[PDB]
Structure formats: C-alpha cells, structure tokens
Amino acid sequence: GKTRGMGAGRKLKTHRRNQRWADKAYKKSHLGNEWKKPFAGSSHAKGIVLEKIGIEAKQPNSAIRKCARVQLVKNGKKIAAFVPNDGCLNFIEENDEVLIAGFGRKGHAVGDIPGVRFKVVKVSGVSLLALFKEKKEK
Amino acid sequence: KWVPVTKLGRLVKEGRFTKMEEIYLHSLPVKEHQIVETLCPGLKDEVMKITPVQKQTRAGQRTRFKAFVVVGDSNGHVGLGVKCAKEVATAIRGAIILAKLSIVPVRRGYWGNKIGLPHTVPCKVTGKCGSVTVRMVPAPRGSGIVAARVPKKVLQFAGIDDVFTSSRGSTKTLGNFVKATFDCLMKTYGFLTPDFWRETTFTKAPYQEFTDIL
Amino acid sequence: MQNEVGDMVDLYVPRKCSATNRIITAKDHASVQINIGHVDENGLYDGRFTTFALSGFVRAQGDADGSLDRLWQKRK
Amino acid sequence: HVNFYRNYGKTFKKPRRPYEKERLDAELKLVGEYGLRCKRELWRVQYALSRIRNAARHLLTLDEKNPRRIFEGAALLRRMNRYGLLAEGQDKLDYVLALTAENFLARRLQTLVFKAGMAKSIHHARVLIRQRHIRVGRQIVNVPSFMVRVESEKHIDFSLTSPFGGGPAGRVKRKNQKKAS
RNA sequence: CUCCGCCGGCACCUUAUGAGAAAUCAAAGUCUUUGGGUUCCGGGGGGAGUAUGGUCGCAAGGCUGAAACUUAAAGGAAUUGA
RNA sequence: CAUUAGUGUCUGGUAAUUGGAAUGAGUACAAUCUAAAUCCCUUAACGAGGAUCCAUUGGAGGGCAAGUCUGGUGCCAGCAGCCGCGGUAAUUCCAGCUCCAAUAGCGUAUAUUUAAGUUGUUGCAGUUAAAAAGCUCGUAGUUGGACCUUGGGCCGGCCGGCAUCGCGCUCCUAGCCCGGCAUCGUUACUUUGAAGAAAUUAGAGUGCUCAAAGCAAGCCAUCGCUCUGGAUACAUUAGCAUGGGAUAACAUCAUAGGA
Ligand SMILES: [Mg+2]
Ligand SMILES: [Mg+2]
Ligand SMILES: [Mg+2]
Ligand SMILES: [Mg+2]
Ligand SMILES: [Mg+2]
Ligand SMILES: [Mg+2]
Ligand SMILES: [Mg+2]
Ligand SMILES: [Mg+2]
Ligand SMILES: [Mg+2]
Numbered sequence A: 001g002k003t004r005g006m007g008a009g010r011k012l013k014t015h016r017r018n019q020r021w022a023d024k025a026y027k028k029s030h031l032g033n034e035w036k037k038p039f040a041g042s043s044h045a046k047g048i049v050l051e052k053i054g055i056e057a058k059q060p061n062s063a064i065r066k067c068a069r070v071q072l073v074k075n076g077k078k079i080a081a082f083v084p085n086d087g088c089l090n091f092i093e094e095n096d097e098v099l100i101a102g103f104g105r106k107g108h109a110v111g112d113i114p115g116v117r118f119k120v121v122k123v124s125g126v127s128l129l130a131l132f133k134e135k136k137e138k
Numbered sequence B: 001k002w003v004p005v006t007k008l009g010r011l012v013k014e015g016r017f018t019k020m021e022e023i024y025l026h027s028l029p030v031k032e033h034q035i036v037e038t039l040c041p042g043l044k045d046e047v048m049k050i051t052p053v054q055k056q057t058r059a060g061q062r063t064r065f066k067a068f069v070v071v072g073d074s075n076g077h078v079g080l081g082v083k084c085a086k087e088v089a090t091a092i093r094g095a096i097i098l099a100k101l102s103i104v105p106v107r108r109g110y111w112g113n114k115i116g117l118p119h120t121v122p123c124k125v126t127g128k129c130g131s132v133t134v135r136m137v138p139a140p141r142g143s144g145i146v147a148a149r150v151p152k153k154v155l156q157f158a159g160i161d162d163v164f165t166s167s168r169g170s171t172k173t174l175g176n177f178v179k180a181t182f183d184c185l186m187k188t189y190g191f192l193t194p195d196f197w198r199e200t201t202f203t204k205a206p207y208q209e210f211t212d213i214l
Numbered sequence C: 001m002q003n004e005v006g007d008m009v010d011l012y013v014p015r016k017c018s019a020t021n022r023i024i025t026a027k028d029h030a031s032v033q034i035n036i037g038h039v040d041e042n043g044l045y046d047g048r049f050t051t052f053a054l055s056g057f058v059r060a061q062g063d064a065d066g067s068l069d070r071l072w073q074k075r076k
Numbered sequence D: 001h002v003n004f005y006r007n008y009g010k011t012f013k014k015p016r017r018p019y020e021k022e023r024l025d026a027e028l029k030l031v032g033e034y035g036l037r038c039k040r041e042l043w044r045v046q047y048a049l050s051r052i053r054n055a056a057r058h059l060l061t062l063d064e065k066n067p068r069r070i071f072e073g074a075a076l077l078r079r080m081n082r083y084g085l086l087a088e089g090q091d092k093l094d095y096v097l098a099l100t101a102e103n104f105l106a107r108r109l110q111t112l113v114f115k116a117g118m119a120k121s122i123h124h125a126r127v128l129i130r131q132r133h134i135r136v137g138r139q140i141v142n143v144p145s146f147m148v149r150v151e152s153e154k155h156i157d158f159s160l161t162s163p164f165g166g167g168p169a170g171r172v173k174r175k176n177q178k179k180a181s
Numbered sequence E: 001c002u003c004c005g006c007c008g009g010c011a012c013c014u015u016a017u018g019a020g021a022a023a024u025c026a027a028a029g030u031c032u033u034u035g036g037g038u039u040c041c042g043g044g045g046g047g048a049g050u051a052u053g054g055u056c057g058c059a060a061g062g063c064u065g066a067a068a069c070u071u072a073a074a075g076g077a078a079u080u081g082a
Numbered sequence F: 001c002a003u004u005a006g007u008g009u010c011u012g013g014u015a016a017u018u019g020g021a022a023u024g025a026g027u028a029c030a031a032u033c034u035a036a037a038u039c040c041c042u043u044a045a046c047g048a049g050g051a052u053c054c055a056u057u058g059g060a061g062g063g064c065a066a067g068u069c070u071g072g073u074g075c076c077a078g079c080a081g082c083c084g085c086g087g088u089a090a091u092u093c094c095a096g097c098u099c100c101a102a103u104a105g106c107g108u109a110u111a112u113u114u115a116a117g118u119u120g121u122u123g124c125a126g127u128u129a130a131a132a133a134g135c136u137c138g139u140a141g142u143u144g145g146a147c148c149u150u151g152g153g154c155c156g157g158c159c160g161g162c163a164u165c166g167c168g169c170u171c172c173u174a175g176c177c178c179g180g181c182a183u184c185g186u187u188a189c190u191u192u193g194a195a196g197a198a199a200u201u202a203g204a205g206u207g208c209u210c211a212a213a214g215c216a217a218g219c220c221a222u223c224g225c226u227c228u229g230g231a232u233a234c235a236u237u238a239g240c241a242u243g244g245g246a247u248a249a250c251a252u253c254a255u256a257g258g259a
C-alpha cells in the first residue's frame, strides 16, 4: 500500500519522480529526441522537391497516394509529403520550393498512407488551396 | 378496460388513494402500471436509447432491440424501464410500462440555506451498476446540472435543479450508466439524517385499513 | 425536512426499523409491519394493538425473531 | 513603451460542446426573442452572470459577522438593485444565485425601448438605437446593449435631433421635397 | 476410546447483510460514506529483457537496462452458436 | 363562425413583388484635434432598391448540427483526426441545388492545459486484464501500545476574575496589607500581530455614450469655486514577536552529586 507517514514527503515525491518516466507522453516530451526529428521541434518547414513517387494504400483500401519526396532546407533531411487534393500533384514540379506541415497526430502516420506524416501546404509561395480553388495562380 | 388483479389495483380503482406516497410509506410492490397513471397525472416518458443485441444461431444471428425509457414528473418521482423485444415499438411500449412500474421517490434538499423550494440532492450520494459509479454532490442554487447527457436527462425528470456530478467506469455503457444514476437517485431516501431521528408513529397498511371492503 | 419559513417540504417521512433504526425504503419488499393485539379481559381482544416494523436487513440476517422477541418485552 | 500597461480582457467563452440540439435551441430562443445579433451577445451575458454568481457563492460560503461577507454583500446587493436585477425585499444574497440571464437581457436598452413603446418591434428598436435616435438622460447612446439602471429608466426618450422626437427631417424626407419642388 | 470447552495450525462446507468485470472470495469484506503501518512493483500492443555501458561468473549465464521504428487494438471474464 | 367554411391572426416567407420613411459606410466646406500634421468626436452639402453599398470559413454516414436529391466517376481519381467511403443505384469522391455551425471571422500545423481518478497527496492499480522480489535476516528511512488534574464549584453580561490540597521573587509595569514577574528542558503545531514594492489578481467607488478601459470626477447660480477620491484584501516556505499546551517529537530522578 501507499506510504502515509507525516515524515514521508521525500518518499512520495521521489516515487512520483521515478514513476513519471513510465508515462509515454512525459517521456516523449522530457527525453530530448524531438530535436533529432526532421522538423526539430517546428510546426512547418521549407524544402525542395526531389522527385514524385506515389505510394499504395494499406489493405482495406486500394488506390495510389501521390506524394513528393522533399529535402528540408534547414537540415538536409529527406522526407515524403502527401499532396492533398484531386489533381494537385500536377501543380508540383521538380526543384521548386514547397512549404510542408505535419499531418496531424503529431508525428504518427495518418489514415491509410503508410509511413507518411507530412503534407505539402504551399508551393512556389502560393497555397495549394488557392491553386485547387483557382483563387491564385503561380 | 383495466379490471385490476391486485388489492392495490382495486383500492386505486375505487379511488381511495390520491398520491403515491401512501404506497411508498408501506413499501408495497406495485404490479399494475395503471396504479401509477391515476396517482401521477402528468408523468412524462422519453426513450433514451435503442440498442440492438444479437444471439448466434445455426441459421444466423437473431436480433432484438432493447429500449431504455426514463419517466417522471419533474416534481420528485422518477422511474426507469428497460425492455427487449423483437421490434422497436413493442420494446418501447414494454419499456414505458416497466418504467412506470419502477417509479421511485427522490428527496430534495438545500445546499446551504433553507429558502424557497428544494433544489439539490440532500447530501453526497453515490450509485453503482456494473463498473459505473456515479456521485452526486449538493450544488449552490442556480448552478445548473453538471452532468453528462444521460444522467442529466434522468435528473431533469427528477426535478433536481442544481447538482455536481462525477463519474467513474465505462460510462459509454449506457445501460449501466443510466441504471447507476437511477440507483443513485433511489437511495437519496435511505440516508439517516437527524431530521429523520424522530421516532416513527406507524400507520395501518392499506391491506389493513381497507379490510372490510376486500 | 423543514423550509426555513416553517413549512414542511419533505413528502412521506419514511418508517424506521424498530430494531436497527435503519430507514425502510419504498422499494424494500422484505420489510414487514407486525400488529400484535392487546388482550385485556373478558373476550380478551379489542381493536388495540402495538406495531413493530422490520426491514429486509434484519429479516435476512435471521435476527428478526430475536429482535421481535426482545421488542415485545416492553410493559405497559 | 508605456501604453503596454493598459489592461484588456475577454468577455465571453465558447461552449464546451459545439453541437448539442438542446442548448442550440435554448440559445436560439433568446437570440430571437430579444433580437440579438449573434450567439456572442448571449455568451457575454452568461459570462458576466457566472462572474457575479461565483462572487455570491464565495460570500455565501463564509460565515456571517465576517466583515468581508458584510461589506461585499452589501455592495453586490446594491449593484444588483441599482440595475433592477432584483426585486424589493430580496436583499438576502441568496436571491442573487437565483438570478437568470433573462434578467440581464431584460435590461438592455433595446429591450427597454421596445417595452416602452417607441419601437413597434424588437428589431425596429435595435435599428432605432443604432441610428442616433434615442437618448437616456441628455446623451445620444447608440449601443443597444447599454444596460440601463432603474433610476435612469424614466428619462429615456427620443433624441432632440432625430425626426421622431426632435427636429429636422432625414435624407429622404428632404430629398423628396426637393424633387417635388 | 467417548462427550464438552479454550488456545494455536493445515484446510473444508453452507451462506450474503459484503465485494467484484465476472470467474469467484469469509477475506479478494469493513472504498466516491475514498486515510492503521510499511516494503516492492504497473501505466496500450510490439520492438525487448533486445542494443549499449557497468557489475558478478571458469563458462553457460545472472543482475541493472534503453532508443529509433512500428501499430488500433492486444488482452480479461462471461454468453449464444459452430 | 369552427359548423360548411373560409383566410387573418403574431405576418412566418419564394416573393429581382408596390410604397415612402431611417441611417451611416464613402465624399467633403468648416471648426476642433496636434509641436506641425493625422485619426477620432461635432458638422454644411452630397451619398441606398437589392443585379447592388452583392459575408466568409468549414461542413451535411457516426462521433457531431445538417440530404436515404440530382449529374459525373467506377477500389480509379479521390476523401477520411478515428470508425470508415469508393470495385456501374457512392447519404462519405468530383459538382449543382439545398441545408447546418460560427460569423468579420473561420480553417490547418506544432507546443501546452483540460478531459486524465490514463501519474492518483487529495485520488488509481498489482489472483486471472500490465504489475508481490524465490525466501528469510538486516542498517539508515518511515511507523510506533496504555499511563501523570484543570476535574468538583463561585463569579459577572463565549470569556474574563477567583477559589479547592495555585515551587518564590529585590529589579519595569507596582491596589485603596493587593491582581497580572521576568532567566535555573527544547521544538514541531496552532492563534494574533508586525514588516512585507508597484504593475498583475481579487475587490470598493465612479454612466470613458456601452464595453474592453482609465483613475477619474461631481456639484455649483452646472458665475471669481465648493466637495473630493485616488479604499480594501491575498501573499505558500523561511525569518521576528504573542497566547495556547490537546496532539507528536527530541532530551531525561535511582550514584539522591536532590531541593
Ligand atoms: Mg498517454
Ligand atoms: Mg481449532
Ligand atoms: Mg498510459
Ligand atoms: Mg507499455
Ligand atoms: Mg476466453
Ligand atoms: Mg459555403
Ligand atoms: Mg466536402
Ligand atoms: Mg460528422
Ligand atoms: Mg445528426
């Protein structure tokens, strides 16, 4: 059972200190490996498109998910970013600047796309939203 | 019509019972729902959930629908009925009749000051069904009902206005959540408070007052 | 119990078990109420009785018999 | 850089549960009956009410003969009476907790202009107040959420320069006269 | 050897007025009405008792013990069928 | 009337129906603002018929509010936080219409709080769901049985002041021989007080036209000036002082080296 002594404050406080490391969220935020990730603790990052690849969807689905492999400017890492909309892959060209964000779920893959946790949100300084909705052109 | 089959039903048909409190005082089992529908004029019912349950058989899976119906005038009587049937409408009808049969009193109290009409539960009360435990704590007047949709509906039909609720367990199991809330309400009258310390002056039970008629 | 302006706001003050002082709730169907008659003289019965209430707790322990035995031994 | 020291605050808060039918309908009842422009007007009244209720509950928690309870209770009750939010004989500080958002909504200059005549409607009353058309003691107020006090409720009337209680006509009333001539 | 009683053991049988997700349990009871004292230890499934560093051992191995990555369930009890 | 109708009530409305009234967005003489300008507040004259002075962002299977409508496509393209949708009758894609929520704002990414009694002191668990060390000893650590008067009364209207079988005083306070005196065990705990920056927080007052604010202002005959305000509180731990002596620590009358 729990220690209950009046003079037990050290035991309780040190015990909580030790046991908090068993919690995945605490350990994820207090261990430092987020600075080793592609974005290095950033919401967005700019990159240069290296190639367009295209990835299959997992078993219950069947489709080709069209993604662009990007190189991050700040650190030179290489990632794959989904291009969200119908026909927006044709806006992407080779060696153009692109603004990438997370997919949601904070670094964990979304939906049926295997091993992709990044999404393309801007190309050539112009939104994919404005290009898909014809508000602006590049 | 009715043609009741119980002594209580007969006494109610002859009209020698006006409220439900002379049946509550004597802990009598109410077996016919019409006894309620005369003694409680404005009783309101509501379906809270329809749930399909299935049993596996060699031919396939046989489906049945279970209905949860809370009833109550918002002036201190609530009942809860659950009924399983092959068709939603008859499950609902059976749930209404069971909910009326289950009507129980709920005592109301004051948080701090005994001004006006009673608004909260008298004191801290808890209820359990399965893994779900529901706690109800007195609240200051005008503070609303701090509860999830299911216990909020149950408490609204009870006429309680202000209460702080907390819960634990698998509340997503609506069956146990609603029955835990009902069980919490039904035991507001089972706590021994100093205003209940006065010795009881017993009264003749309805089977014994109306002996000559029966 | 009582509103602060004198009024009585509870409805149906419940009975209390005559052995344990527990409340006999509305849905406690194992409780009973006994009326034992008063024998006085010639005839040895008129409509005079003393009443005792026993809740389902006592009746289910079995201690209803002992409790009733001891509660009937009160002299008047 | 002074002027960084000027305070500011939030007046309302969004609902915890976005889409619940019961609250949605209850709120739309008020937004319609009192002619409010959007949910934010209802939510700021709720937020002010919740503030005054937390204050009242705290003072009720203490014990009487506590001079904080005494002083702040007298002040809060005076504030509630000053805006007609509380009937006479109600200075018990438990009747503050019973107070409702409908009571605050009942004191807005829109609702009072409607209730005094002068308006023929609740939306006519709003458009009437936002067009410099109504004064309170001597001043032209064009904020429909003015929250009159009970003392100044008598002196509400039309402006001395609006056509409906004042002087010269408007743009169109003159324009038709000039094209007529 | 028989009968009765009291301490102390290993257990068993019947029962909820109890507890529990239940199976069950007279201790797994005296818990939202939550506080007798104390030690160890858990925090979704994997990766993994793995890598690495330390330490003990002749050795086999023991103790201590991660991360990247991956995944929407894995799992407990009970019910109806097959 | 409610019969059998028919219309008339609060007008609920597709109604680019008809009709004037109202107004500030904009424009601008002027005055005012200001160091000089500017913006605001006043303001002459202009300035509203609904195609315009044209409201958006997200959605419509569930969670979760709102279509078993119509075209396209056919496990493709695509959507989808999660469950899932799409393989020729798509409530989920691409569009139209319609509807829904918030609204001058709304969506998305990341971090963080809540939800989370899923870090648990309050307050979680450990037979079988993750989890009692194979077993015992053992130091620190944590925890620790009962026992030594304020008990029996007076006293004035919760407490003072005494009296029972109250270890003393020279020295400070010292009633008209008289209460209420100080060093010859310490702490934790509790009570009260002092000293604690402002800004922030809470909060009293005050009609910046309301509000977010600010620290002002209000009356005079709104005439040779009157009344002014610019409170109050919280502030864990440590340190200083004050009363209490239940609870619990630590020190300790058997060498009488006692008074
Ligand atoms: Mg977690
Ligand atoms: Mg034995
Ligand atoms: Mg966890
Ligand atoms: Mg784990
Ligand atoms: Mg199994
Ligand atoms: Mg839209
Ligand atoms: Mg869409
Ligand atoms: Mg949805
Ligand atoms: Mg819906």
Ligand SMILES: [Mg+2]
Residues within 6 Å of the ligand: A104, F081
């Ligand atoms: Mg999304």
Ligand SMILES: [Mg+2]
Residues within 6 Å of the ligand: none
């Ligand atoms: Mg799935």
Ligand SMILES: [Mg+2]
Residues within 6 Å of the ligand: F092
């Ligand atoms: Mg959807």
Ligand SMILES: [Mg+2]
Residues within 6 Å of the ligand: none
């Ligand atoms: Mg669509």
Ligand SMILES: [Mg+2]
Residues within 6 Å of the ligand: F118, F124, F125
């Ligand atoms: Mg847990």
Ligand SMILES: [Mg+2]
Residues within 6 Å of the ligand: none
């Ligand atoms: Mg196992």
Ligand SMILES: [Mg+2]
Residues within 6 Å of the ligand: none
């Ligand atoms: Mg296990």
Ligand SMILES: [Mg+2]
Residues within 6 Å of the ligand: none
């Ligand atoms: Mg030790």
